[PDB]
Design a protein around this ligand. Sequence first.
Ligand SMILES: NC(=O)c1ccc[n+]([C@@H]2O[C@H](COP(=O)([O-])OP(=O)(O)OC[C@H]3O[C@@H](n4cnc5c(N)ncnc54)[C@H](OP(=O)(O)O)[C@@H]3O)[C@@H](O)[C@H]2O)c1
Ligand SMILES: N[C@@H](CCC(=O)O)C(=O)O
Length: 277
Amino acid sequence: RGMSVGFIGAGQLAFALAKGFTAAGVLAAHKIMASSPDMDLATVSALRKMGVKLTPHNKETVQHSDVLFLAVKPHIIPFILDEIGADIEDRHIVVSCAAGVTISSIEKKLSAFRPAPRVIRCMTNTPVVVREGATVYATGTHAQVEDGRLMEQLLSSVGFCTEVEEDLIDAVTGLSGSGPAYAFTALDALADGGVKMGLPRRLAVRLGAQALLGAAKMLLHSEQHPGQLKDNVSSPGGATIHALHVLESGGFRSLLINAVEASCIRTRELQSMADQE
Ligand SMILES: NC(=O)c1ccc[n+]([C@@H]2O[C@H](COP(=O)([O-])OP(=O)(O)OC[C@H]3O[C@@H](n4cnc5c(N)ncnc54)[C@H](OP(=O)(O)O)[C@@H]3O)[C@@H](O)[C@H]2O)c1
Ligand SMILES: N[C@@H](CCC(=O)O)C(=O)O
């Protein structure tokens, strides 16, 4: 309530959260602060015209923030903790959402400033911007049960939220993390298809979106099972069972696994890459 928030990073995810946060009417635009290394017109400017405090000093951020968000590239993270760790007061919580980066790696490096640093690993996705972002997190060792709450509450406002035992976050990323992208991609395709049948762009694209959003809800709001809802919509006639057959023909599913995997495996590597060099 008297809580302030900051993003040492910036970019999309920052702006994204920034956005869904003020959106959630949970925080005040100006009650937010993020450091602008260089400033990426789009992102930064956006936030600026958004009403959030943007400073080139990812230090003032550190002070202004009752809760800290690490919104930088994974490889950047290091060059930060040891540039701000000296400013880590016992008040704020450090929420790192940089993918791949481990809690350990941070605690056990940020301890070299504060005896017991309070930190939690985070994982979300741009859709948070509206409020559908899918989030999951893990509590550090210096995790006092009142933070896992604030967190779970804070994020669970701009989306879905749930505790997760860190050793999952990597899989989780190649899913809820990247997933959106897969969608934006599938849609762009569908749209093309609708057009390849006459439908206009602005019309088709949008019909596809509305169909995805719809399928989403149904599956969530029921147990059923995807395969269930599958049969439940393909009349022995066709047009659908037929469209399926085609997708089915070209390993459509296979391609989705492949991507979850790719994304995951990649994340494994990114982190298991800065453990040394
Ligand atoms: N703060 C918010 O604004 C907020 C927060 C949450 C959700 N939503 C909103 O979310 C709505 C969609 O609610 P939702 O679909 O986002 O929440 P959600 O994705 O349904 O939360 C996630 C998963 O928990 C599943 N689940 C049930 N038993 C489980 C178990 N034993 N282990 C693990 N997972 C289990 C649910 O699916 P199943 O029911 O098929 O079991 C669900 O897919 C939208 O209508 C949007 O308005 C908004
Ligand atoms: N917290 C609720 C909100 C759902 C909604 O806003 O539709 C849930 O996750 O079900």
